[PDB]
Amino acid sequence: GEIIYDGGLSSKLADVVDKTTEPHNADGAVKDGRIAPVKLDLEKQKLDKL
Amino acid sequence: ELIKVPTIPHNLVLIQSDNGKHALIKEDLGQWPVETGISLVNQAGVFAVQLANKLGIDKPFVLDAGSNYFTDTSFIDTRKYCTDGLSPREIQKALNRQRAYYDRPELTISENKTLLSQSIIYPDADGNDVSIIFSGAMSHAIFTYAQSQWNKNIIKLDDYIREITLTVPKQ
Amino acid sequence: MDVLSKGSLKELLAHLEKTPLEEAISYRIGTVPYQNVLISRNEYYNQLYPDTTSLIDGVSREGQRNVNGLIMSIISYVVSGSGHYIPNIGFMLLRRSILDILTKHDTGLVTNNLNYGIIARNLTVSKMNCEQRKRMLICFKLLAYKDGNQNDYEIYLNQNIPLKQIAPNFIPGDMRTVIHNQDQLAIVGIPAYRLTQSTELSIRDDNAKSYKLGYVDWYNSNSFLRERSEFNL
Amino acid sequence: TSGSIINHANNLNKVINHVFADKPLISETMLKILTIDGTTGKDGYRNWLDKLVGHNYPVYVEPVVNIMNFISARFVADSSYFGYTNEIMIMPNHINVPVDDRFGFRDSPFCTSLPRTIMGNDVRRISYNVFSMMEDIDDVISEGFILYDAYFNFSYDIMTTDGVTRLKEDILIVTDTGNDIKPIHFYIYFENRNDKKLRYESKMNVSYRLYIKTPACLLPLSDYMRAQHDYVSPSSSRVYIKDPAVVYTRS
Amino acid sequence: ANRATSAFLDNPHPVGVNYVDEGSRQFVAVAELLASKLIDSSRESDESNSDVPFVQAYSKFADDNPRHLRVKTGGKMANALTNVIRSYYSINAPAIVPQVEIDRLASKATVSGDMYNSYAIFNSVPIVEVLSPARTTVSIVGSDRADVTMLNTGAGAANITFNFGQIAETVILKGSVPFQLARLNQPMPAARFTYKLRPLDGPFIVVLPVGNPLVISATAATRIQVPLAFNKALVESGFQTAMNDGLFDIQNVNYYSSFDEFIISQYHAQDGINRVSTCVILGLALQAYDQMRRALPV
Amino acid sequence: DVPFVQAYSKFADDNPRHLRVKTGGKMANALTNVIRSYYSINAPAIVPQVEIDRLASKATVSGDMYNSYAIFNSVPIVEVLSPARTTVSIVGSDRADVTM
Amino acid sequence: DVPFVQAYSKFADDNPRHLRVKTGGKMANALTNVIRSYYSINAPAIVPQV
Amino acid sequence: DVPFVQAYSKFADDNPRHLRVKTGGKMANALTNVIRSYYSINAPAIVPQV
Amino acid sequence: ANRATSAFLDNPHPVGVNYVDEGSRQFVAVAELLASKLIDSSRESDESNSDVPFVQAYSKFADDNPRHLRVKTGGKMANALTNVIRSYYSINAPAIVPQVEIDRLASKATVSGDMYNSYAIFNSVPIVEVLSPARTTVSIVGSDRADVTMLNTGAGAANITFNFGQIAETVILKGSVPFQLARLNQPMPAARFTYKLRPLDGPFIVVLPVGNPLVISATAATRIQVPLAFNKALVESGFQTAMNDGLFDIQNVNYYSSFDEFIISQYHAQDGINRVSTCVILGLALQAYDQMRRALPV
HEC string of C184-225 equals CCCCCCCCCCCCCCCCCCCHHHHHHHHHHHCHHHHHHHHHHH
Distance CA E24, CA E35 (A): 17
Return the C-alpha torsion angle I259, I265, I269, I273, nearest 10.
50
Question: For residues E136 and E158, is the Cβ–Cβ distance under 8 A?
Answer: yes
On the CB side of E274, CA atoms within 13 Å amount to 8
Residue E270 near residue E167, CB atoms below 8 Å? no
* Cβ neighbours of residue B156 closer than 8 Å, sequence gap 6 or more: none
- Residues D86 and D91: their CA atoms lie apart, in Å, by 17
Tell me, in Å, the resolution of the deposited structure: 2.6
Q: Are I245 and I134 in contact (CB under 8 A)?
A: no
Residue C101 CA to residue C74 CA, distance in Å, equals 9
Residues of B with Cβ-Cβ distance to A25 under 8 angstroms: 37
F99 pairs with which residues across the strands? Answer: F89
b/e code F18-36 from CB counts within 10 Å (16+ = b): eeeeeebebbeebeeeeee
Residues 6+ apart with CB under 8 A from D229: B132, B133, B134, B135, B137, B140
Q: Do D76 and G15 touch (CB under 8 A)?
A: yes
Question: Which partners does chain E have (≥3 C-beta pairs < 8 Å)?
Answer: B, D, F, G, I
Question: CA-CA distance, D224 to D226, in Å (whole number)?
Answer: 5
Residue E134 and residue E167 in contact, taking contact as beta carbons nearer than 8 Å: no
Q: How many Cβ atoms from other residues are within 10 Å of residue D78's Cβ?
A: 19
The CA distances from residue E150 to E7, E124, E132, E158, in Å, are: 17, 21, 9, 10
Q: Residue E77 is which amino acid?
A: M
Question: Which residues in chain E have their CB less than 8 angstroms from residue B104's CB?
Answer: 48, 50, 52
Distance CA D73, CA D51 (A): 31
Q: Quick check: A33 contacting B, CB < 8 Å?
A: yes
CB contact under 8 A, D119 and C190: no
In Å, what is the CA distance from B14 to each residue of A32, B92, C34, D100, D217?
A: 35, 11, 73, 19, 12
Partners of E103 on chain D (C-beta within 8 Å) are 115-117, 120
N-terminal to C-terminal alpha carbon distance within chain H? 32
Task: Give the chains touching F; criterion: ≥3 Cβ pairs < 8 Å.
Answer: B, D, E, G, I
Rounded Cα distance between F16 and G18, Å, is 8
* D204 three-state secondary structure: helix
Whether G5 contacts chain F with CB within 8 A = yes
Enumerate the residues of chain I whose CB falls inside 8 A of the CB of residue E201: 270
Report angle CA E77, E81, E83 to the nearest 5 degrees. 120
- Residue E253 and residue E275: Cα distance in Å, rounded? 15
For residue B96, the tally of other CB atoms under 10 A from its CB is: 15
Residue C159: CB atoms within 10 A of its CB come to 10
**Alpha carbon distance E184, E267 (integer Å):** 25
The answer to whether F21 contacts chain I (CB < 8 Å) is: yes
Q: How far is CA D108 from CA D158, D165, D214, I191, in A?
A: 11, 8, 9, 65
Minimum Cα–Cα distance from E50: chain B residue:
B104
H or E, element range at E96: none
CB contact under 8 A, D128 and A11: no
Q: Which residues, 6 or more positions from F76, have their beta carbon under 8 angstroms from its beta carbon? A: none
DSSP C45-66: -SSPEEEE--TTSSS-BB--SS
Query: Strand E118-122 vs strand D228-233: parallel, antiparallel, or unpaired?
Result: unpaired
Residues of E in contact with F92 (CB under 8 A): 145, 147, 217
Q: Residue C183 — φ and ψ, nearest 5°? A: -80, 155
User: Half-sphere exposure (CA, 13 Å, Cβ side) for F56?
Assistant: 11
| Chain I CA closest to residue E183 | I270
CB D136 within 8 A of CB C197: no
Task: Name the closest residue on chain H to residue B77, using Cα atoms.
Answer: H2
Q: Do chains E and G touch (3 or more CB pairs under 8 A)?
A: yes
C194 closest CA partner among G46, D141, D129, F76: D129
Cβ-Cβ contacts under 8 Å, E147 against chain F: 91-92
Residues of B with CB below 8 A from E41's CB? none
Whether the Cβ atoms of residue E121 and residue E260 lie closer than 8 Å to each other:
no
Q: Which 8-state DSSP code applies to residue D19?
A: H
C41 to C20, C36, C45, C231: CA distances (angstroms): 36, 16, 6, 43
- Distance between start and end Cα atoms, chain F: 62
G with H: 3 or more CB pairs under 8 Å?
A: no
**Chain centroid to CA E136: how far?**
33
Q: Give the Cα separation of I241 and I258 in Å (integer).
A: 11
Nearest-by-Cβ selection for D183 from A9, A15, A29? A29
Least Cα distance to D43 among D25, D10, D11, D20 occurs for D20
DSSP G13: S
Cα separation, C111 vs F15, in Å, equals 70
Asked if F76 has any chain B CB less than 8 Å from its own CB, the reply is: no
Q: Using the CB atoms, write b or e for D19-43: b if 16+ within 10 Å.
A: ebeeeeeeeeeebeebbeeeeebbe
Q: Is G15 on the interface with D (CB under 8 A)?
A: yes
Closest CA to C102 of C137, C56, C129, C131: C137
Does B164 sit within 8 Å of D221, measured CB to CB? no
Cα C66 to chain centroid distance, Å, stands at 18
Give the containing element (helix H, strand E) for E161.
Answer: strand E158-163
Determine the number of helices (DSSP H) and then strands (DSSP E) in chain H: 2, 0
Helical spans, DSSP H, in chain I: 22-47, 52-62, 75-89, 99-106, 232-244, 259-267, 272-295
Report whether B105 contacts B96 (CB < 8 A).
no
How many alpha carbons lie under 13 Å from residue C145 in its C-beta half-sphere?
14
**Of G39, G34, G7, G12, the residue nearest G23 (C-alpha):** G12
Residues 6+ apart with CB under 8 A from B97: B16, B20, B23
Q: Which residues on chain E are in Cβ contact (under 8 Å) with I272?
A: 200
Q: CA–CA separation, I6 vs I141, rounded Å?
A: 8
On chain F, the residues whose CB falls within 8 A of the CB of D78 are 1-2
CA–CA distance, G33 with G37 (Å, rounded to integer): 6
How many other β-carbons are positioned within 10 Å of the β-carbon of residue H10? 11
Q: Are I157 and I208 in contact (CB under 8 A)?
A: yes
- DSSP letter at I158 equals E
Beta-carbon count within 10 A of G14 CB: 17
Contact H5 B113 (CB under 8 A): no
Whether E239 and E262 have beta carbons less than 8 Å apart is answered as: yes
Q: For residue B111, give the chain E residue with the closest CA.
A: E48
| Alpha-carbon gap, residue E127 to E125, rounded angstroms | 6
Nearest CA in chain D to I60: D56
Query: For residue E154, what is the enclosing H or E element?
Result: none
Neighbouring CB atoms inside 10 A of D94's CB total: 10
User: From the candidates F9, F11, F15, which should be mutated to test the interface with D, based on the most D CB atoms within 10 A?
Assistant: F15
Separation of alpha carbons E246 and C161, rounded Å: 29
**Nearest CA to I33 among I298, I241, I284?**
I284
In 3-state terms, what secondary structure has residue C227?
helix
Asked if residues E124 and E8 have their Cβ atoms less than 8 Å apart, the reply is: yes
Q: Which chains touch G (3 or more CB pairs under 8 A)?
A: C, D, E, F
Query: Among D115, I114, B45, B40, which residue's Cα sits nearest to residue G15?
Result: B40
| Cα I108 from Cα E69, distance rounded (Å) | 75
CB-CB neighbours of I108 under 10 Å: 17
Parallel, antiparallel or unpaired: strands E2-4 and A14-16: unpaired
Chain F residues in contact with E174 by the CB 8 A cut-off are: 93
Q: Is I238 exposed, middle or buried (0-12, 13-18, 19+ CB in 10 A)?
A: buried
Q: In what order do the strands lie in the sheet with B80-82?
A: B69-71, B80-82, B120-123, B129-134, D228-233
d(CA A40, CA A21): 17
Q: Which of I288, I279, I287 is nearest to I89 (CA)?
A: I279
Report how far apart, in Å, the C-alpha atoms of A2 and of each of A5, A8, D195, D196 are. Answer: 9, 16, 14, 12
Cα dihedral across residues I88, I93, I98, I104: positive or negative = negative
The answer to whether residues A23 and D179 touch, using CB atoms and an 8 Å cutoff, is no
G14 contacts in D (CB within 8 Å)?
86
Interface of F with E in 71-90 (CB under 8 A): 87, 89-90
Name residues whose C-beta falls within 8 Å of residue B37's C-beta, 6 or more positions apart in sequence.
A25, A32, A33, A34
Residue G49 half-sphere exposure toward CB, CA atoms < 13 A: 17
Cα Rg of chain A (Å, integer):
23
C181 CA: distance to closest CA in chain D (Å)? 7
What DSSP line would sit under C144-196, residue for residue?
HHHTT-HHHHHHHHHH-HHHHHT-----TT-HHHHHT------SS-SPPTT--
Please, which residues bridge with residue I140 across strands? I148
C130 to chain G, closest Cα gap in Å = 6
Burial of E19 from C-beta contacts in 10 A (0-12 / 13-18 / 19+) = buried
- Name the 3-class secondary structure at C232: coil
- CA-nearest of E25, E57, E80, E39 to E291 is E39
CA distance to partner chain C, nearest, from residue G37 (Å): 11
What residue type is E116 in one-letter code? Y
From chain I, the residues in CB contact with F21 under 8 A are: 112, 114, 116-117
CB B107 within 8 A of CB H7: no
Three-state secondary structure readout of I30-67: HHHHHHHHHHHHHHHHHHCCCCHHHHHHHHHHHCCCCC
Q: Which of E278, B141, E96 is nearest to D78 (CA)?
A: B141
Q: Is E touching D (3+ C-beta pairs, cut-off 8 A)? A: yes
Burial of I204 by CB count in 10 Å (0-12 exposed, 13-18 middle, 19+ buried)?
buried
Residue I252: CB atoms within 10 A of its CB come to 9
**E59 touching B, CB under 8 A?**
no
Q: How does DSSP assign chain B, residue by residue?
A: --EEE-S----EEEEE-SSSS-EEEEE-------EETS-HHHHHHHHHHHHHHHHT-SS-EEE--TT-EEE-SSSS--PEEE-SSS-HHHHHHHHHHHHHHTTPPPPPHHHHHHHHTSSEEEE-TTS-EEEEEE--HHHHHHHHHHHHHHGGG---HHHHHHHHGGG----
CB–CB of A14 and D178 under 8 A? no
Residue F18, chain I, CB below 8 Å: the answer is no
